[PDB]
């Protein structure tokens, strides 16, 4: 045996148990809770390192020999912040733990066997998270997809048909034919994709036709008419077909208030967009639904974190998104907002308390597609600076806060939309949609994206260079992004009904086609680290939000992290 200095050990292999790492330039400190490695047997790749024929690459590998192994990765996940080797086989996460050669090392399971068929990826000093899941995507342009992908989002659930006005306003892909258009266009992109149908219809036949055509859920948007009748019928059909329903409630209170909308929902699982109201007429009373069990609340990028400039852009964003001409007196008079800095500030505190479970974008319709993760971590850092460490922290670290805010965009949307069996976390058996971050750039710019077990996007230097590092370095598509490899790498999510009817063969899709499941029997209690159901007393006379009596508010941030240190523009 021998003892080496912890500084040298960490430089060689990355942090081990009890070591703390700052996340980005924020104030959040993640502590390695435990380590699967055996000291002195670490896997290293290089000139005379251990990942060599006969030493750590087995000459008699197990039949479960890995296709790819990520060595010495700091896994940051809702299941824990720990250090391990991630083995990927056949596009899934084959094993998490100590990998290597059973012939020359101890404690190597059969599912983490490194052999001659194994590619190596050095994760030492690198954080591995699951890919982001953005569930409010307005499919306005296909250029959103590479932007989100480079930001670190690997699954996009949303709706739209291009820059139509219905798509600019709503997250809706309406009808069997438009669903076919979008499903066949999805073959191009390196991103898991799911499409939502139009729920604004009192016709069960039409709603069921959309679900069988392939939508994974319904979107009931105010711009197509959010009426109690439509809510009721859509929820009935969705309970029949086991698909999620998302709602963007009526801003004008035309048919009723928040109480009438909740009566139409009738205690059935519903995923709510802009649960803070986003200036709608249901605000601020719609925040009350964030305390119900059956409501899965999501909040959008632009209002988090609350900053000095947050309130200035809201009216322009609202008018352009809702398609109200700024040169028309009638449209300007119609564009009435009930937004308040009190509500905007309360949104961040609700996120910190876990009242809000999902963060999303609403891309190019009051929200930025490439900033879901960055704004989530900006909100986490701002809440840490304001209120200090959470009372749930079991140590001198921010692990609980890290896990809560990471669940906000990794596992909670996956549960909400019924894809948690496939994506959302770094677990054995899930698809290998992984993001490699360097801790200095955590939350803003990933090092690389592993899509379906193969690298799909990466920071790359000059192609003519003698090494991959020299400038200019930017995000380039890798081999999993091209040819027929992207068909194996990417997933299209459909409803179970469409999957049974054979949507893949009918539409000639080459991507993997997977059915969503367990969308109707989930409540707020099923969200990870964000299952806080509290009676939210909203005084609309004073626009005051109280949870368990105590009032919630936050101060505007003059300067956020991960914003100007990392981006030229």
């Amino acid at each position: 045996m021998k003892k080496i200095s912890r500084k040298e050990y960490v430089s060689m292999y990355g942090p081990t148990t009890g070591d703390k790492v700052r996340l980005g330039d924020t104030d959040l400190i993640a502590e390695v809770e435990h380590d699967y490695t055996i000291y002195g047997e670490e896997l290293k790749f290089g000139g005379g390192k251990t990942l060599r024929e006969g030493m750590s690459q087995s000459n008699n590998p197990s039949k479960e020999e890995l296709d790819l192994i990520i060595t010495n990765a700091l896994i940051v996940d809702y299941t824990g912040i720990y250090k391990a080797d991630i083995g990927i086989k056949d596009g899934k996460i084959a094993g998490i733990g100590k990998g290597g050669n059973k012939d020359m090392q101890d404690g190597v399971k059969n599912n983490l066997s490194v052999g001659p068929a194994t590619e190596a990826l050095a994760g030492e000093g690198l954080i591995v998270t699951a890919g982001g899941i953005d569930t409010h995507i307005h499919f306005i342009s296909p250029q959103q997809i590479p932007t989100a992908f480079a930001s670190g989002v690997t699954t996009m659930i949303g709706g739209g048909t291009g820059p139509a006005d219905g798509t600019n306003a709503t997250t809706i892909t309406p009808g069997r034919r438009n669903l076919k258009w979008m499903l066949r266009a999805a073959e191009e992109y390196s991103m898991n994709l799911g499409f939502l149908a139009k729920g604004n219809a009192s016709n069960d036949a039409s709603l069921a036709d959309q679900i069988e055509a392939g939508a994974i859920g319904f979107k009931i948007h105010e711009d197509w008419g959010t009426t109690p009748s439509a809510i009721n019928h859509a929820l009935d059909v969705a309970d029949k077909y086991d698909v999620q329903v998302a709602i963007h409630t009526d801003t004008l209170n035309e048919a009723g208030c928040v109480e009438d909308t909740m009566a139409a929902i009738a205690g059935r699982t519903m995923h709510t967009f802009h649960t803070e109201g986003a200036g709608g007429g249901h605000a601020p009373d719609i925040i009350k639904v964030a305390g119900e069990h059956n409501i899965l609340p999501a909040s959008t990028n632009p209002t988090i974190p609350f900053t000095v400039n947050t309130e200035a852009e809201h009216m322009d964003m609202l008018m352009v998104c809702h398609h109200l001409d700024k040169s028309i007196k009638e449209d300007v008079q119609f564009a009435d907002s009930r937004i308040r800095p009190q509500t905007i500030a309360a949104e961040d505190t609700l996120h910190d308390m876990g009242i809000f479970s999902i963060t999303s974008s609403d891309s190019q319709a009051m929200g930025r597609v490439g900033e879901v993760i960055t704004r989530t971590w900006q909100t986490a850092d701002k809440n840490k600076k304001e209120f200090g460490r959470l009372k749930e922290e079991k140590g001198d670290n921010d692990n609980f806060r890290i896990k809560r805010y990471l669940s906000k965009y990794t596992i909670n949307p996956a549960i909400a939309h019924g894809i948690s069996e496939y994506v959302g976390s770094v677990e054995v058996g899930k698809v290998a949609d992984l993001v490699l971050w360097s801790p200095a750039f955590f939350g803003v710019k990933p090092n690389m994206i592993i899509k379906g077990g193969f690298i799909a996007l990466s920071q790359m230097g000059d192609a003519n260079a003698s090494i991959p590092t020299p400038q200019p370095v930017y995000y380039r598509e890798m081999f999993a992004h091209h040819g027929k490899a992207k068909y194996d790498a990417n997933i299209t999510f459909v409803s179970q009904a469409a999957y049974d009817k054979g949507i893949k063969e009918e539409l000639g899709l080459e991507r993997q086609v997977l059915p969503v499941k367990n969308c109707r029997n989930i409540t707020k209690k099923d969200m990870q680290f964000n299952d806080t159901t509290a009676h939210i007393e909203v005084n609309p006379e004073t626009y005051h939000v109280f949870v368990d009596g105590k009032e919630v508010t936050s101060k505007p941030a003059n300067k956020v992290s991960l914003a100007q240190l990392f981006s030229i523009f």
Partner: protein, 260 residues
Amino acid sequence: MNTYAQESKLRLKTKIGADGRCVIEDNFFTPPFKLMAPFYPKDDLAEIMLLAVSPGMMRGDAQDVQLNIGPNCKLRITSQSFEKIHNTEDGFASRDMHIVVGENAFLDFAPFPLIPFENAHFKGNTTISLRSSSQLLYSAIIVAGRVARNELFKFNRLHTKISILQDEKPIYYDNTILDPKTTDLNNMCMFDGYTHYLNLVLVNCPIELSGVRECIEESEGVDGAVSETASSHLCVKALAKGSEPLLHLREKIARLVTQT
């Protein structure tokens, strides 16, 4: 105790554009204020809507408006919707509006009625400055509260000061104080069972007292009157059960002024 990140300011300066229309020369607005491009109806004056991106004034709100209409500008300034004063628990909502009208400029300031909620404390201070040739049509409608739900005079206090100066000389003073705690505003001298009160000031407008009186008399559902102030400018005070007769009377008077 301003809940907004920065102070609520709205500095607007309008001038005559190259094409002869009334354009916004300069504008600077912090939340909740916002300014869009002026609207140009076919035959009327250039309309500017003072957008307020908020459900209404709440505790600690302190708005600072500074409008500057340049020479030869025919501008009508309206608001998005009814201005509601919310329940200010321990504080108050204050608005300070300073308007400067240039030579040969017509300003029709026609905001929507003010609706104070229960326990509402509001302090408005309007200071209008005019030239000799400037024309002004100022208006203000105050509601007793949410009348249809039996919320009558339940607010804390409404103070509204209006000071109109011409050539830097005071020509109109108004001090409207409504404090239900001190006195019953429902008495025969304050409101006499009416719920909406309109105060209109016509300065240098080319309309006759007889014409204004005829308009008031032909207006239905309104108990109103018009007189001449010390500086020989028209002052109209009207009461009504609802805001519809008052708005109709105000637009009738505005049309009578503009048709000249």
